[PDB]
Symmetry: D2
Subunit: 217 residues, 4 copies
């Protein structure tokens, strides 16, 4: 493959015991780090805030500094691939885990994601649609061995009450083959991201900007 230009996603699973299923497609620009995605529900109205599906709704679009391939891009490029496993531990006792798999077809990516979330309080912000936005975020990546990224960030939404809603997020990424030694010696690597989400009860339109950095200006 070359760098990605387009992608689709089928994402499904359950939140508080209630099944959900979405699909759609999007595109992005793998040199800029930007991507956008449209999703539509296959099982009626979502009963939970669509914002809970971020960050889960494609780091193949993410370059590393000075136009280098991120390990994600490299793994797409030679076709050896990777999977991700993410955990979100919310401050109010909720948990959401996800598994991420991909199939490549030239410069197009097909994502299959499975999520399980539970323990969202009936009156907390996820079940009342009270999440309003996700804060700008710094992701910290380390490679504890040659085929794994352990990444972390503190994830916060703003909400309608003005109180933020917090979780600890950890993403373990497992590669089909060794990450290039030149990527492995620049640790830690950070990535600054911004997202937007417009949404109804049945549809999402998401956009994301990403930029990797070892150091700041």
């Amino acid at each position: 493959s070359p760098l990605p230009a387009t992608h689709d996603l089928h994402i499904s699973g359950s939140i508080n015991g209630h099944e959900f299923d979405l699909e759609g497609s999007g595109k992005g620009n793998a040199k800029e780090g930007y991507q956008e995605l449209h999703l539509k529900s296959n099982k009626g109205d979502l009963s939970f805030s669509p914002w809970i599906l971020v960050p889960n709704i494609f780091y193949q679009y993410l370059p590393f500094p000075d136009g280098a391939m991120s390990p994600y891009q490299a793994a797409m490029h030679d076709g050896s691939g990777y999977v991700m496993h993410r955990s979100m531990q919310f401050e109010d006792g909720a948990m959401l885990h996800s598994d991420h798999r991909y199939i490549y077809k030239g410069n197009h990516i097909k994502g299959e994601f499975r999520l399980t979330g539970s323990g969202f309080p009936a009156d907390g912000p996820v079940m009342t649609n009270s999440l309003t936005a996700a804060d700008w975020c710094v992701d910290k990546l380390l490679y504890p061995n040659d085929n794994t990224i352990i990444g972390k960030f503190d994830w916060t939404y703003t909400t309608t009450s003005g109180k933020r809603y917090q979780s600890d997020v950890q993403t373990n990424v497992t590669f089909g083959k060794p990450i290039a030694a030149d990527i492995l010696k620049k640790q830690p690597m950070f990535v600054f991201r911004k997202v937007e989400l417009k949404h109804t009860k049945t549809e999402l339109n998401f956009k994301q900007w990403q930029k990797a950095f070892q150091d700041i200006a």
Copy 2:
């Protein structure tokens, strides 16, 4: 349904990116809290310690104090059911999540479990088969609303080096209908458990004893 007498399990997923799949059956005694289970691999040798599959490898076998039905037993009994979502956060950066679903057929239970584990160090105790046993365990249960248990325990194995291997484990249990009000007013509830596991690279034989308690002698 009545109380369970027998069960089978199909359990599958991936550990460090490597797929695994097991099935088998067992039985137990729902008044005593005891159950045993035999499992066999459908995909060759496990490349990870089988002990990592405990606690994941049926609280329907668990009575509450003085022969009362546990909420698990009650949910089987009227057929309204429940699911579980468990998270294990290991001290060395590994994570393992699981989703648990059941189907009842009279006094027989069919479990379908899906697990994703990742970030196990190549030289840590899971990938070297160095777990030797699981410590006796106290599970602490609360019901933050009428259809959910949030349970927790500190989970430790002994290992061949003599160092214990630790994780934080949280199990969120989501019920199809409200838990009985008489169960909901006895919080917290604790459960003392013991397990044994004999195993090879392709087969497991597990046993478990459980006893619920609000207070001790």
Copy 3:
């Protein structure tokens, strides 16, 4: 050196930046695990729930099963002693850590505890004095080496709104001499405890029951 029959406590530090200081005296039964304590404020009215000072307000009162001494008691008995370091990580972002020291004078314990708690939201149950009780509790103990206990429990209060207030609690205990081999080989050890607190803005009246168990 005898098992403890009476004790004093001086506990101080700050909560959300506001200094506090209490002292008092109590007693208990080291064969049974029970003790009780009275504390009075030296700096005016407490600005936070006094319940936040539990569990921090003496495991020298705790025996082990079958009349054995707990490690806490043995270290009092030989004078070698120990310190505790405790951390409470609250679900709403607050943190409270404490440092515990003791002087023994025959059967009397003097505690000097220093505490820093911070980050408690102005409308949370601690700052609105809305905590009503602490749930009964199981403490899981391990000894990762011969002079250290690492213990954990999930700590929950009931509150006036009905919704519980939770924290993760880790207590590390460090001994001046090795723990006896016979205690070391019985792991985990669990301890079941119940507490009561009656309080006003200046005074606390605390009781506790505790009992070690390995199995039920």
Copy 4:
């Protein structure tokens, strides 16, 4: 009240039960974020890696973007001040918490920091003095109310074995007066920092670079 140009530190407490006490002096540039510090032990040779005292070894040196004062600096500037409470939760079960206070005398800061660390395994990198450097670091800051900062970062050292040593770090900062509205509305704020440490068993020589950012 001027921005800081020099500072002293007295830092004490215990690690694994062993008391330690250091003092010294340093300086820095409050327009640039840099500061450096020298510390000397008053109680003999340290029995643990001196790296464990970082990050704990002065954000009054930290400016905010475009020459604005950080909240730390503004609270020095008006004399209203603040305290910090920090917690480090290590991957191997150790815990280290600290309490930070300051006295200001014109452009000079006096710090008094109290620390308790415990649970560090005898064969871990802290007790074998095997920590070699601290990774560069991004601190995420939020203000859940008008006098409080709640900050977090994942803290990692490199060690002689090649394997990193990790901890979760939460710092709660409490202000004697409200933070300015204009600082409050810019959340999150991030801070990028680099540190160096040269040390012997009795002496530390510490430098730090820091720079706030909202975006890159």
